[PDB]
Amino acid sequence: PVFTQDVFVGSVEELSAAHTLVMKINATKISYRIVSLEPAYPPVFYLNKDTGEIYTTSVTLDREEHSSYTLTVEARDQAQVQIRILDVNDNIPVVELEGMVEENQVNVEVTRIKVFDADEIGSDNWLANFTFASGNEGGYFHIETDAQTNEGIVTLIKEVKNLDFSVIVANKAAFHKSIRSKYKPTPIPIKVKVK
Amino acid sequence: PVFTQDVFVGSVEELSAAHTLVMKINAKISYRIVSLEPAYPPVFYLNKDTGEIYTTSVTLDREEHSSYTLTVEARQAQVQIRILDVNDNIPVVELEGMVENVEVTRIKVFDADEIGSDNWLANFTFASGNEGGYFHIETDAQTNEGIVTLIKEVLDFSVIVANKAAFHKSIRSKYKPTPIPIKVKVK
Amino acid sequence: NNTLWTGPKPEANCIIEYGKQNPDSKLTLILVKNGGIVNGYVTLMGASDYVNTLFKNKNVSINVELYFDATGHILPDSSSLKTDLELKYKSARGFMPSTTAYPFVTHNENYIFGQCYYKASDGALFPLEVTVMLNKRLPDSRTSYVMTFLWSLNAGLAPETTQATLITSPFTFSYIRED
Amino acid sequence: NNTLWTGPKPEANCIIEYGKQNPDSKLTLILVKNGGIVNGYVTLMGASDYVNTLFKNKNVSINVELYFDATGHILPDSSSLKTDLELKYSARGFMPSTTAYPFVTHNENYIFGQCYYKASDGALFPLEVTVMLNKRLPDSRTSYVMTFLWSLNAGLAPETTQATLITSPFTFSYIRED
Amino acid sequence: NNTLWTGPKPEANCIIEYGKQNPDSKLTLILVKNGGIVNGYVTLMGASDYVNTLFKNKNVSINVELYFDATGHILPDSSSLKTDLELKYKSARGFMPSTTAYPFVLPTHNENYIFGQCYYKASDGALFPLEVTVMLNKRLPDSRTSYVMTFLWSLNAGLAPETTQATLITSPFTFSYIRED
């Protein structure tokens, strides 16, 4: 009848398949019933009333529209469950250029490209990775991702005319199966003048 | 050989299906369309016995032509058909504001429908960042601008833009909502 | 015999410009009985000038309607196919869609959607959205079965500039038949 | 006899409400013999409040699983069809092949198609359907496995009200067992 | 008996990489006669290294020809299926595509094509859409043959579907044509 804990902390992943096991709550014949969710209008979780298991159901999840769930159950003959949705990679990083170099300058900053990725801030699914397309053949520029606010800062390598180029955007971790084979690489260029 | 009126009017929906009744002209009379002012597509088919203008197998578009003036003889007269716009053409946004109830930003957009109507007004929602309660929206209708105003005096957020009314049955189930970021600065 | 023909290469028997009095487009339509369903084959070839100058536009909806009777022959006065459908080796109610699973009457369990492709003359490939509507309606009192076809096309770039012939990819589909 | 019906227009015989004992959604499934293959016709109509209010949400994955035994009569205890199929007038020949779709990776047990959902005002939403043949085993008394998966992700909601979940008729063809 | 087989899961019989005599892929092709048409079932499976290293690129095309003869068998000297097709319960003039609906032309012509779509489920579960262009007669290789049936799978992806080597299996494609009585 009575329960064994008060905070059953578990997790499940974003955009997962239906009827994956979130967690298995436990209590010391019993029958299980959810009495409240934190969002009332989307029914997202299912309580298996036989063995005390939490499943996802036919409508799947999204972490970006609602990040963490808190839901109270009660068994008959209350206690709180705190479910955090683990973020998987989804929607493509989008890009919003000019810069100036000089004669024989070494390792100087040209541009700091901004990028709005709509994923979880801090993780490997928001950190952008910028790869070159055409213009950096002879070893001219290097790219780093500053992880303070996701800045694709470029810098010089050699010491150097209108040598403009282009960069291609991706996340640091690879894409999901639900977003790849729709991601088309559009290389948005970068213009730079020597002086 | 004699009509009843001189200037006919009518209204047909933009992007409607074929064989819909546009208007019913009147004057056995064999009704005979002889000229259109936009002449290269035959968009209107006149049923010769009854004078019912129908939309044939090629469909219309308001954004190319909003008024078709066609002259018809009943064996002369004018026919002036106007097009009622439905809501295709998803809006597009061409965005930084610093604070210290002061308005922050001004968001200028560009629709493509009839200017003034409720298929032109950009209605601005909230996507990720107003859970602190900092921005209230305002749709400046007379020039279609997304004004925001402060709520709680003291961070960035994003806006999902849509029209005032719901979209058409064709451009929905293709519209992917892309969030658009606004960066607010504070001193 | 279990094949309702139209012709492997038929002549002009279908009108597309609504209001002509001579047929101007060929329509190939093959129905075959298969167990409890009917498999279908349908394509459309424009064989005039106006139908061949349809795809210079960017939004085109081509409608082709068929109205059978209780026996199962096309009434050509009110249909849009101006030639009866003939058998192969020899009552032809067995190829008609069922009024138990697609009843007359909203009620959008009648439609069957799908796709074909138009191969443009410059190597381009455009998708055409095919809507095959079953019974759904009664135009007359003597009409007992309805089957309509619709080729919708919306495209940004214009498909053709000069006049080529109109030819669509074949379409295959299946429906529950009347016994 | 060359048809496995469900009825032309049945009552509810599937279960999508995960944890109900009574059926709440109808589906029409017709399998016909044709030479070396079997043609298949399938559509799914909702018949309760939870099934009709699925498509107020963006992402919805409907899953219908069928477990035929050694003969071919559907086990109504572990499947999702709670009513077995009937002939038009055993039923081993309609079941899929085991030397073409073997058990256990092994991505040859799938047939990928596409169907449509006519919305409340009508907007032609594309549903991606996946027919997984056998590939798995619940226990040691089921012999053949079939699974339909109707997946939908969308830009906006299909409908903000409850109308009916009626999907388009999907057609397929698989290799049959002798 | 109304089924032109190839095998439910046969050995390697098809050949891509023209310039080779080792059969390097498997091809299940089932053509079932039905009324006045022929339904089909096409499945291409990888069975060697060169077919499996194709999808490391992004704009690829896999071509298969079937040049029949005057009576309905496959000429192995010119086609790309070096194994004759069989019946189910053993003349195959009935399963050939029709020459009065798909006629032979000689100099464009576009009334004897079939378009379709299949899918490639990758190594991590990502569906890639492949286009299928089933071309009936349209052409003639030489004077020995009498019917032509070609298949072609094109893919123009955005990224690479694979990096290592896996068995290139396509989704089964279904189609129908008019037969020659």
Numbering used by the authors:
A (entry chain D): 108 to 135, 146 to 194, 206 to 224, 228 to 291, 297 to 331
B (entry chain E): 108 to 134, 146 to 193, 206 to 224, 228 to 233, 238 to 291, 299 to 331
C (entry chain C): 130 to 219, 225 to 239, 245 to 318
D (entry chain A): 130 to 218, 225 to 239, 245 to 318
E (entry chain B): 130 to 219, 225 to 241, 245 to 318
From the paper:
The first step of adenoviral replication involves the interaction of the fibre protein and more precisely the globular trimeric knob with an attachment receptor from the host cell. The intermediate portion of the DSG2 ectodomain, consisting of EC2 and EC3, has been described as important for recognition by the HAd3 knob (HAd3K), the trimeric globular distal part of the fibre protein. Here, we report the structure of HAd3 fibre knob (HAd3K) in complex with one and two molecules of the DSG2 receptor.
A second minor complex harboring two receptors per trimeric fibre knob was also found. Different population of particles with either one or two EC2-EC3 modules (HAd3K/EC2-EC3 and HAd3K/(EC2-EC3)2) were identifiable in agreement with the 5.40S and 7.34S species previously reported. Their 3D structures were solved to an overall resolution of 3.5 and 3.8 Å, respectively. In the 2:1 complex (DSG2: trimeric knob), the interactions of the 1:1 complex are preserved, with the second DSG domain EC3 interacting with the G–H loop of monomer ‘A’ and the EC2 domain interacting with the A–B and C–D loop and N-terminal portion of the D strand of monomer ‘C’. However, the relative positions of the modules differ slightly in the two cryo-EM maps (rmsd of 2.585 Å between the two EC2-EC3 modules) likely due to the binding of the second module in the 7.34S species. The main difference relies on three extra glutamates (E146-E268-E299) from HAd3K, which might be involved in the second module interaction while they do not participate to the first EC2-EC3 module binding. In the present structure, however, the interaction surfaces are different and the 1:1 and 1:2 binding modes are largely dictated by steric hindrance occurring close to the three-fold axis of the HAd3K, likely resulting in less favorable binding of two EC2-EC3 modules binding and extensive clashes if a third EC2-EC3 module is present. The structural data confirm the biochemical data since clashes occur with three modules excluding the more commonly observed three-receptor per knob binding mode observed for other HAd-receptor complexes. In addition, the non-classical stoichiometry of the HAd3K-DSG complex (1:1 and 1:2) results in non-symmetrical binding of the receptor to the trimeric knob.
